[PDB]
Design a protein around this ligand. Sequence first.
Ligand SMILES: Nc1n[nH]c2ccc(-c3ccccc3)cc12
Length: 292
Amino acid sequence: DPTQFEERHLKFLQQLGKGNFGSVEMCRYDPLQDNTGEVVAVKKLQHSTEEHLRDFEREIEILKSLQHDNIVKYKGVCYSAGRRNLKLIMEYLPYGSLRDYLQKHKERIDHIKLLQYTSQICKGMEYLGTKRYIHRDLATRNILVENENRVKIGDFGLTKVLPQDKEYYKVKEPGESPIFWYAPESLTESKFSVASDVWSFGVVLYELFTYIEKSKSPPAEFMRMIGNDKQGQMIVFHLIELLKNNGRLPRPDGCPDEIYMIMTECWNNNVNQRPSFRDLALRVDQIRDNMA
Ligand SMILES: Nc1n[nH]c2ccc(-c3ccccc3)cc12
């Protein structure tokens, strides 16, 4: 069974970053101990408590159930003897996160390339929604670059399955929340749906067309709009009030009008009025086609 990975054969190579409750490391799976084994990405929990272990195991099952070109590939799991610590083994994508990639190359990644990525992100999200999963954490830091032509959604640490008879998931005790990517109803009511994922996708699109410029980041811009003096819980209060009054991120400099229109449609206060991922993928592909 190639999906069974023995821990003692995993050699640390380097850190790939922190993903909320876990950390990711590039490791070589080297059972021959001759440095010829496959390089893989290993996700593990920083604090592997009961509750966290339970959530991590659901995360692993979620990822194992997804097979798509634009979703990072599940490879297997590590089990520890005794207390049953879990490690998630995934394919290694060597160009790193889209956030770092775009921050590095900036405008050398042209609009044609940005829209190819948008389309791939859209397709990965559409497929996710057909499984009734809600991502809840869609941001360029959670998207990975395989090569110049392909990106994949790379982390599913906050992903939840919808109840059979509901079209939203409600979070009763929120943890660390990426509030600057949140839809209004997620801020006010902790309600998460395909439509709040679409809102966050609008924010991802904004990130892409600002080329991850620090002064233009969603946190920087929303803080500017509510006032940099706002702190802690008051940030959430003022953000809710800003969004209610149609305060929005500005059009990135140089952004095509058709692309900006997509963002603004995703950021609808009316949940039902937001576009679908199926339609967004059709629209982006048409725009790419017009440009080519
Ligand atoms: N470079 C990668 N190849 N495969 C991966 C799987 C997960 C993450 C990751 C996700 C969130 C935070 C940090 C790293 C990174 C990679």
